[PDB]
Design a protein around this ligand. Structure first.
Ligand code: HEM
Ligand code: HEM
Ligand code: HEM
Ligand code: HEM
Lengths: 146, 141, 141, 146
């Protein structure tokens, strides 16, 4: 991913305000609600029967933390997403066989969650920079398919 | 296919746009053109600069079309038949672009309507926009 | 969204299929499992070997459901409500898989009915299968 | 793309029966009929208003021949598709901005055409081998997006 120094600064600044404990769970939870077939990958996670059960599910919140940490690892090394995500790509592609369109969906749900949290601060240029990041992360996750 | 609950959610949520129709529609277009620059290819003679009156004007049209879709949500192909002929027959817009605009509309609504944009309403709005997109990309005359 | 002409093409084509509906359904499933092995994960307890009586039995069920859908092409959500609950709510099939089966059905039809599989009929059948797929991947109760 | 010796033999035997003057045009023509937005990329080709107009269009047939030639070339370089198709990838992605889902669609329309022409010869194992090939070609064309 090629971000201008201005774009990188904008993304980094915003991310520093993102709640490490909650935003990942909000994004993962919304993925499960908005695109229900994704629940098939999370059988062991317990109760996903209703939007409220999903968003309050402890395992969804916990797992979401990890997911966010991986996005955070991406932001720390934008020039080597493929390397950073190699193990996760093997997991999601070779082992789990997640269709790669779903990687794009989660990235876009995260973007919606950022917009929801930050309101007018999530300007079109800030969004454009984040879209480059989540496209890069999705591509890196899908690398074993390519 | 929309559930009864989906239709309820969409009517309630879009109903809050009101006089901000032009504004939100314009913001959604601006987000699309900036985030996904390939979409600009469909508007070769537009002023697509920030704050463009032409984009503002177009935003109102899109928003009003969405208002039309909501008021005819059980019978959308017949209500949007003119818009389908424009986008599918005349402009031949690649279906991927409707996913891009739909995403930017959702981002816009999330940024402006925090209380309304619950996970359930988010899910309903996504389905609604996908349904509108299918109609606008179909040739069914 | 299907055109009136699309609906006529689909009914005419599926009519020509007739008594071979079940055989073609079984062949489409076999083509899918072989060409796209990830689809086998939805049938973990199935005998998926070549000539499997279980796949044959399932192919007939799939074909009969399509025949029902063709019969109710104007009212598919109501006609397929039970099947939608099964695939969207219970089995949670990723929508990509419906694209894969739809393709394998078209391939099966092309191989068995080449005279019937004109460009116009190909187009109408693709739209029809996409429409069925959308119904089966929607939760609309 | 790795094919078993059985798969390679089967792919080669089927391809030898392909009419190289017609099949590319049939595949391209059916792409324009079945997925009509793809016509936007071929505005200069003239009459595309009806299925009969598309299928009988000389420029569709001629162009189709080139496309088929690219598939034919790929069959001889299955272990180096990303390299072989690099120039074409730059053309379709960087210059024409074709969304990569359309590459998948054309590959699958080609498979339908082979099924149409060869019926009982186009068995499910033969199809499976060809799906590997057209997936490989589509992936290589999309490489500039990855
Ligand atoms: C697109 C961005 C994504 C990122 C950054 C991401 C990141 C992660 C991480 C960090 C883990 C934990 C890995 C470990 O502990 O070894 C994980 C596991 C997992 N992911 Fe994702 N993921 C993404 C998309 C998805 C999607 C879209 C799905 C399904 C629709 C999915 C399904 C799973 C599953 C099933 C697991 C294992 C859960 C378990 O332990 O039972 N992932 N992912
Ligand atoms: C929810 C989705 C959409 C809605 C509701 C919508 C609605 C509209 C409306 C109301 C108009 C004006 C029609 C008129 O003047 O009679 C229009 C025009 C147009 N739309 Fe959209 N549209 C949508 C998606 C898209 C997308 C995704 C694209 C391309 C990326 C697109 C490209 C265009 C173009 C090029 C025009 C004509 C502009 C001009 O030259 O005047 N539309 N649309
Ligand atoms: C045109 C598309 C499809 C049609 C018409 C269709 C139709 C059917 C029918 C009629 C049944 C039998 C239901 C019953 O008798 O209780 C069934 C079951 C099932 N379908 Fe589909 N289906 C379609 C697509 C798919 C796809 C794409 C997948 C997965 C890749 C899938 C996975 C399943 C599974 C797992 C079952 C249950 C099998 C069992 O355990 O007994 N279906 N479907
Ligand atoms: C998926 C496999 C595809 C292959 C193997 C392929 C191959 C080719 C080849 C060999 C050329 C000629 C390049 C040259 O003359 O330098 C070409 C040009 C072109 N391709 Fe494709 N292509 C594919 C998919 C697509 C798709 C899906 C589209 C969507 C519209 C597309 C749009 C075009 C256009 C517009 C041109 C230039 C035509 C002109 O000269 O006016 N291609 N392609």
């Amino acid at each position: 991913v090629h971000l201008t120094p201005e774009e990188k600064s904008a993304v980094t600044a915003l991310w520093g305000k993102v709640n490490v404990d909650e935003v990942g769970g909000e994004a993962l939870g919304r993925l499960l609600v908005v695109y229900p077939w994704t629940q098939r990958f999370f059988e062991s996670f317990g109760d996903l029967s209703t939007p409220d059960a999903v968003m309050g599910n402890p395992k969804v919140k916990a797992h979401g933390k990890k997911v966010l940490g991986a996005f955070s690892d991406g932001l720390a090394h934008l020039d080597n997403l493929k390397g950073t995500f190699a193990t996760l790509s093997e997991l999601h592609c070779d082992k789990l066989h997640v269709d790669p369109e779903n990687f794009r969906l989660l990235g876009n749900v995260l973007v919606c969650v950022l917009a929801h949290h930050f309101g007018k601060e999530f300007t079109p240029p800030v969004q454009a920079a984040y879209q480059k990041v989540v496209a890069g992360v999705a591509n890196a996750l899908a690398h074993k398919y390519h | 296919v929309l559930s009864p609950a989906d239709k309820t959610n969409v009517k309630a949520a879009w109903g809050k746009v009101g006089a901000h129709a032009g504004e939100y529609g314009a913001e959604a277009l601006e987000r699309m053109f900036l985030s996904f620059p390939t979409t600009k290819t469909y508007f070769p003679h537009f002023d697509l600069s920030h704050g463009s009156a032409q984009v503002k004007g177009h935003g109102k049209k899109v928003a009003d079309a969405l208002t039309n879709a909501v008021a005819h949500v059980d019978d959308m192909p017949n209500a949007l038949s003119a818009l389908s002929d424009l986008h599918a027959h005349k402009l031949r817009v690649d279906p991927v672009n409707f996913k891009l605009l739909s995403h930017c509309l959702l981002v816009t609504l999330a940024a402006h309507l925090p209380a309304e944009f619950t996970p359930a309403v988010h899910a309903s709005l996504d389905k609604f926009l996908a349904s509108v997109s299918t109609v606008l990309t179909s040739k069914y005359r």
